[PDB]
Every structure is written in C-alpha cells, then in structure tokens.
C-alpha cells in the first residue's frame, strides 16, 4: 500500500467521524481505535496535517472549550460545505466501486 | 471549497488502473476505452496522465511493459503488484467495517 491510498482512506474516515458530531483530536483517535478492534491507531500528527488543510478549505471549523482536567481544548465541527464534501467523497468512492464492478463484468463477457 | 481534492482523485485513478491490469494485461488505448465504457462515458482518462502514473508504478516495481505481436505496448501487473493489490483491497474492506462500526456506535449512543 502507498501513502496515497492510506491517506485517502484516513481522510474518508475522519470526515465520517466528524459527520457524527463535534470532536477533538485525541477523542477521534480513541474512537477509531475502538471501531477498529484496536488495530487502527491514528497518529495525532497526521490529524494535525489533515485538519490544517480541511480548516483552510472550509470543510471543518473549530472553537475552544473546556476539558475535564481543567485545561482548554480545541474542538472541530463539520461545516455545511464539509457535509457536502463528505457526500461527494462518499459518492465518488461508490462511483469508483461501480466502475471496477463493470470492468469485471464486461470482462466475464 | 467542497469539491473532491486532487490527491484523493489521484488515488482513485491509480486504484482503477491497477484493477484494470489485475483483470488482464492491457495497452493504453484499450485501458482508456474500457474505463470509458465502465464509467458510462463519465471517466475519459488522458493518455499523458496514464504515462505519468505508469512511469511511477514501473519505477516502484508494481507494473511492467512488453511488446505484443505496428506493435502495441502492453502493461502488466507484476507479482509484487498483485500482492500490493491484495493488501489494498484488504484495507478497503477494513475501512468500510470501521465506518460501519462508527455509525453503529453512533446509533447506540442515541
Ligand atoms: Cu468507504
């Protein structure tokens, strides 16, 4: 596997996590670890790079709030633009799946 | 804005092209025609773009090329290419279950 497909898959995952509601970097990593039965351990540095780009693109926004130990935490939200990006990304992967399915079928024929 | 980033599209193009070669050795004009048909005309691949992609995949040992029986130049997935496609498809299925599990845990919390 090359960086690009892993990175593409991570991006798809992060958008689907943020779709569910506001979140923070360490909480996202925890949830993805749990949803992967412990196998996918995303690195916070990867999220920082991704979230920087998405914030610039207008796909996510952020705000500050409290956290439990008494400090301050940056929270992230999928914007309206970001919800459309999420839909297009999901649509695009489904179109790619269909192209390959059709390739395999036109072959058998 | 909201449109699909070019990095993700490049990943989708590579995935399509490697699946075309997994299905059988092929030449550039034939790959373009088959992808055009399989996408019902919505994906017309550019020959120069394929050469960029094929140059890197050959450098990485994922594909190779050879002459057919004007001879056409055929491209083939290498033995390493076939393995890397097995790995790629495995993660694809795993990512989909992870998203399903995230969705499923979301519904439970509600
Ligand atoms: Cu998916």
Q: Which of B1, B2, B25, B96 to mutate to test the interface with A (most CBs of A within 10 A)?
A: B2
CA of B64 to the centre of ligand 1 (A): 30
Neighbours of B105 (CB within 10 A): 13
CA separation for the pair A20, A37 (Å, rounded): 19
List beta partners, residue A15.
none
Residues sharing a CB contact under 8 Å with residue A99, sequence separation 6 or more, in sequence order: B16, B35, B38, B39, B43
Residues sharing a CB contact under 8 Å with residue A23, sequence separation 6 or more, in sequence order: A17, A31, A75, A76
CATH of domain B6-109: 1.10.10.10
CA separation for the pair B67, B73 (Å, rounded): 5
List beta partners, residue A73.
A65
CA separation for the pair A97, B77 (Å, rounded): 20
3 state SS of B77: strand
CA distance A68 to chain B (A): 20
CA of A70 to the centre of ligand 1 (A): 37
CA separation for the pair B50, B45 (Å, rounded): 7
Q: Where are the domains of chain B?
A: 6-109
CA separation for the pair B110, B96 (Å, rounded): 21
- In order, the DSSP letters of A59-107 are SEEEEEEE-TTS-EEEEEEE-HHHHHHHHHHHHHHHHHHHHHHHHHHHH
Resolution of this deposited model, Å = 1.8
CA separation for the pair B18, A96 (Å, rounded): 12
CA separation for the pair B95, B98 (Å, rounded): 5
Neighbours of A108 (CB within 10 A): 6
User: Is B100 within 8 Å of A33 (Cβ atoms)?
Assistant: no
3 state SS of B66: strand
* Structure-solving method: X-ray
Give the rounded distance of the alpha carbon of A2 from its chain centre.
Answer: 18
The CA-atom distances, in angstroms, between A108 and each of A27, A102, A104, B24, B85 are 46, 10, 6, 11, 20
Give the rounded distance of the alpha carbon of B26 from its chain centre.
Answer: 14
Vertex B31 angle, CA B29 and B33, to 5°: 70
3 state SS of B39: coil
A3-108 to CATH, choices 3.40.640.10, 4.10.220.20, 3.40.960.10, 1.10.10.10: 1.10.10.10
User: Could you say which of B10, B23, B84 has the minimum Cβ distance to residue A104?
Assistant: B23
CA distance B71 to chain A (A): 23
């Amino acid at each position: 596997i090359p960086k690009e497909m892993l990175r593409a898959q991570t991006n798809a995952i992060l958008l689907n996590v943020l779709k569910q509601g506001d979140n923070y970097v360490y909480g996202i990593i925890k949830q993805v670890k749990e949803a992967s039965n412990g196998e996918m351990e995303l690195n916070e540095a990867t999220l920082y790079t991704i979230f920087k780009r998405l914030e610039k693109d207008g796909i996510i926004s952020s705000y500050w709030g409290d956290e439990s130990q008494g400090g301050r935490r940056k929270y992230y939200r999928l914007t309206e633009i970001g919800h459309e990006n999420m839909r297009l990304v999901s649509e695009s992967w489904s179109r790619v799946d269909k192209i390959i399915e059709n390739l395999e079928a036109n072959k058998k024929s």
